[PDB]
Amino acid sequence: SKNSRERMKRIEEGIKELGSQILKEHPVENTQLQNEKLYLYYLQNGRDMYVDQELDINRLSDYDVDHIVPQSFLKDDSIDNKVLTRSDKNRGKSDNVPSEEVVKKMKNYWRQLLNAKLITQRKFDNLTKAERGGL
């Protein structure tokens, strides 16, 4: 729902806060960010959100756009409820938020993305909800 100019501005500022060279190694124009997988690729600094591994920018068609809170529970199809991951099977269980195993190993990177304004507090709260009960 974010306009391509607003999407480019959010990525450029967040990548700058990370000190990342991903925009230098993979240049992109604002209109290209209308693709949700490519937009999530830069929002995550080319990293998987559920596994400690890189995302291959040429393999985006093979990756999954996973809903943090499953759509059978929450009616939210925005970026605030989505991540790009190599396989949505790596989220843990399918009928819940990402598993506590994923939370403990990934929360520090999620925290860094939050401070860099690449995810919202609401998105960080839903990503880590397994360590507070789940659902």
From Swiss-Prot:
Phenotypic effect of disruption: Loss of correct processing of pre-crRNA and tracrRNA. Loss of immunity against a plasmid with homology to CRISPR spacer sequences.
Active site location: H67
Biotechnology: Coexpression of Cas9 with an artificial single guide RNA (sgRNA) which fuses the crRNA with the tracrRNA in human cells has shown it is possible to target and modify DNA sequences of interest. Cas9 plus the 2 sgRNAs have also been expressed individually in human and mouse cells to achieve DNA targeting; cleavage efficiencies of the artificial sgRNA were lower that those for systems with the 2 sgRNAs expressed separately. Microinjection of Cas9-encoding mRNA and a synthetic sgRNA into zebrafish embryos induces targeted mutations.
UniProt domain HNH Cas9-type: residue ranges: 2-135
Domain of life: Bacteria
Subunit organization: Monomer. Binds crRNA and tracrRNA.
Homology family: Belongs to the CRISPR-associated protein Cas9 family. Subtype II-A subfamily.
Protein function: CRISPR (clustered regularly interspaced short palindromic repeat) is an adaptive immune system that provides protection against mobile genetic elements (viruses, transposable elements and conjugative plasmids). CRISPR clusters contain spacers, sequences complementary to antecedent mobile elements, and target invading nucleic acids. CRISPR clusters are transcribed and processed into CRISPR RNA (crRNA). In type II CRISPR systems correct processing of pre-crRNA requires a trans-encoded small RNA (tracrRNA), endogenous ribonuclease 3 (rnc) and this protein.
Record remark on domains: Has 2 endonuclease domains. The discontinuous RuvC-like domain (approximately residues 1-62, 718-765 and 925-1102) recognizes and cleaves the target DNA noncomplementary to crRNA while the HNH nuclease domain (residues 810-872) cleaves the target DNA complementary to crRNA. Has a bilobed architecture with a recognition lobe (REC, residues 60-718) and a discontinuous nuclease lobe (NUC, residues 1-59 and 719-1368). The crRNA-target DNA lies in a channel between the 2 lobes. Binding of sgRNA induces large conformational changes further enhanced by target DNA binding. REC recognizes and binds differing regions of an artificial sgRNA in a sequence-independent manner. Deletions of parts of this lobe abolish nuclease activity.
Name of this chain's protein: CRISPR-associated endonuclease Cas9/Csn1
Species the sequence originates in: Streptococcus pyogenes serotype M1
Range covered out of full length: 775 to 908 of 1368
